[PDB]
Symmetry: D2
Subunit: 303 residues, 4 copies
């Protein structure tokens, strides 16, 4: 039934050492992630350092990546913004350029600006009225906004284009179960995230998609395939094999994991983050590569 | 000795009922606030709904307001952004269009993306390198970032343009006390904020400027002048008279307090916030105007 | 209509200089606060430094303060605890010593340990099933726990003893409006707190009670008097006169406001908090007494 | 050269189904965890549901557990409390009953009551003046209190009994690197926690001790043994084998992991938490046992 399933890794934003956008590295990283087996791509998400770029750069990347994907895989464009009209504009802007789906945090700002449920509902309702592609609601700690399972289900049933969900708050597996139980057939895509650290538990709960990091979709995807085909022991086997790398990305190297792997493999030219995000500790990067070389991922043997 | 002191109210951003920028009303709001006796103005701050406007709208508002002010009063342009290079470029642009000062939060995003002290310092150090006008460090809850007084004085002594501070975390008076003690004459501008709810205590602590709401700066300003010339009983008198209005702004009508008074006074065409910020409860608005009509502020008798 | 209304200020916990309980100063403040015109008292709340005392001191203070009150005014005993059975046992114990009402935060601990709505409901339902006195649900920032107006109203409808509420979260006035509309007759006591900083807005919203600081109940009570008597303009004027002192308590002197006023007024022997809560800044203490001496509060003219 | 190192798992608090203390199961739990190779034990911590018990239960549990240990292993008693004198008196009482060490969060309450750095320093300095056993500073998210690495290093270099640390804030490994460098010889034990989820990275950073869950210390301890012996590939191997179980405890079953495993293995009579802590979802419990039964833990053959 669902339009979109599988692994949809987050595309990192590639900068040159000057801090400017490095679009040549950007298309190569997309090509690798496509060649790695991704069922799709999510762009301008938090692992893309979206908070560190400008509206103009955000426009450049939505055209650059979408035109370079050329229809190979579906693309999820992250369009989060406090203003409803801005988010609807970006979302409509994304669909015209060929986006298959838009993802949006609830409206929020910083540590103190929160939006009541009634206006959060209006926010997603009006973005849904503006576009013809489905909306993925992001339930992540960065928003500091509580989206209960009953409220999430209510939006999927009462708002047409609300159909997908990225549950990455603590206890996502239990929340995924309740989201599916309460939303019924309006929950088209209950997905998890957080670099697939709880993927095994979430697949038990009914997750049909995973928004992972971009470093090694090839290493994670067979877990979902083995889960869909009922090969649960193969699922635990691959999960246990790649869990130390997943755990290192989730806890140590963080956002810069994919870029540090893509740079060591010659996929992109510079793994630098945009200042002032701290760069990777040399030992943290050393341990990341040590773990990654026990698993032989495509990123280190692609260029 | 210092370049700036007094009352520097926040200019709200005036939208049309459709949500687009209402530049005609935006110019009227500036002229009223200048006519209310404001020593200066600060634009694109939290009470300007800056988190709900686009980058293009920032540049539109920065030029349009800095052109309409025509050097009458100095203007602080808020340029906060996570990226160091983006904030520095906005800060240089503000300087080129005639800003007397720039205000920037520490780099942050949402509830979870924080920056360590070392990189925060580098952030302000690099923005100071790019400009020749003073920088106002903002110490506010919205950033979720701890900026200790030893670290704040650290920056004022060892970063060239860092000389002004807006203190509005809880216990701001006692923080203003410790900041002035550790920093001395390097603390050129120890200012307070939060709509001047704690102004009297902050004046005791040694505050020389106040960034307040934009609705009634004529009501608050005599307390700074009365304190400037040692009339602390006159200062208390005007503080007690206007504190119920200030308390209603801080606790009830919030960001929209200024636009509600201007719209009632015919100063602007629309007091609507940009959705999804909740609109004022009708009782909250009536109670706001009931207290305002008791004190005869210029905004209700200007058009 | 309701069992209780009016001002219900929080009784501070009086320590000696070295930090042990000063029950002698503890009883004098109780007498003073009743002299100042309190419709009732709340003990062991946040302004009582309840987080800094032991379980044995909690029972000592509950037994001592309730016996010294002698039924003069109703007493709300704060019984908050993470554990359902501990809070329920505390609330039954308080009821047995003469407590008129119990106040309980939702179950929580620290910055990270929270409780789902379904178990918060079960928490209060079991605390209600254990006692025969009203329960006041505390909606305050300290718990870091979201309690919506529909959830609070549902608890008031479906859980017998849940009938009072202390709304202290931001936007308390409009939340009181939504609570009363959704809860109806189940809302016996929609009250506010936060030292009466938002009282005038809250009285507009329908607030029938206030849990304030204990330093100057005589200063705040006339606002609610004039409000229940329809003298709206006199309520504003009284609110405006005492607002710089309320504001100084809310923003500057904080918890220690009541103790600094009671110490200076000779009501208690020591104002000091229990370490490591910082002591009052000298300037902050001086500005507190300066503002108070403009208002002639009983705490600075109590001869007992 | 440090007094204490190795694995010091948290002893959960065993309740009855009714909610009362189940002391009979409590002693069995302690005996199993000692049987599982624990270098020491930590009691009344967060995985013990310390926030759900009263002071009297706190005292009764400290007496019962210490007496049942009889000095077989060193015991760390968690004595956290906002009040300095209350924490000092708890730490002294723990000492007189034979505790080798005390662990204390910085003073805090709920989501809004924080203590400035200077008063935190006085808090630990005063608890140190009152006792003659080492102090473990707990740097954990539950306190909502930021403790920088220079500050933690300063407390140990300048406060006598402050000598151990449990680093559970995010990015613990990189904070442990800085704390170890800054603290110098003054840090007797830089330890990690969080059920050993970051154990490998924290061993790289120089952690010499781990405060884990109580369900399978036999499964985690060989990781520390191999690392101290310099067998880093073996340390990774045992870490990978047990990481699915560690991950499930950290993210899915949580505090109830140890008790659920012990109840299944017959160690304890009831795995329930104290209400209103939610009970384990049955699917979460079934996934936990499925993973544990792939590893032959002592808890399922005790």
């Amino acid at each position: 039934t669902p339009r979109h399933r599988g692994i949809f890794p987050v595309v990192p934003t590639t900068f040159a050492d000057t801090g400017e956008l490095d679009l040549a590295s950007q298309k190569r990283a997309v090509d690798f992630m496509i060649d790695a087996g991704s069922d799709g791509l999510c762009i301008l998400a938090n692992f893309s350092e979206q908070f560190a770029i400008t509206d103009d750069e955000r426009d450049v990347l939505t055209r650059t990546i979408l035109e370079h994907v050329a229809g190979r895989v579906p693309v999820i464009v992250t369009t989060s913004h406090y203003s409803t009209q801005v988010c609807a504009a970006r979302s409509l802007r994304a669909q015209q350029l060929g986006a298959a789906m838009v993802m949006a945090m609830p409206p929020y700002h910083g540590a103190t600006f929160r939006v009541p449920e009634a206006q959060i509902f209006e926010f997603y309702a009006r973005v849904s009225d503006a576009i013809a592609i489905p909306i993925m609601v992001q339930d992540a700690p960065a928003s500091g906004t509580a989206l209960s399972a009953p409220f999430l289900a209510r939006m999927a049933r009462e708002i047409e284009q609300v159909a997908y969900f990225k549950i990455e708050t603590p206890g996502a597996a239990n929340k995924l179960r309740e989201l599916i139980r309460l939303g019924g057939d309006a929950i088209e895509g209950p997905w998890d995230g957080e670099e697939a650290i709880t993927l095994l538990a979430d697949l038990h709960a009914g997750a049909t998609g995973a928004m992972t990091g971009g470093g090694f979709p090839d290493g994670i995807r067979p877990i979902l395939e083995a889960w869909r085909e009922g090969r649960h022991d193969d699922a635990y086997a691959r999960y246990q094999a790649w869990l130390p790398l997943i755990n290192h990305e989730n806890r140590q190297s963080g956002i810069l994991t994919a870029k540090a792997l893509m740079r060591e493999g010659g996929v992109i030219a510079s793994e630098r983050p945009r200042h002032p995000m701290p760069e990777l500790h040399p030992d943290t990067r050393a341990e990341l590569l040590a773990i990654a070389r026990r698993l032989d991922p495509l990123v280190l043997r692609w260029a």
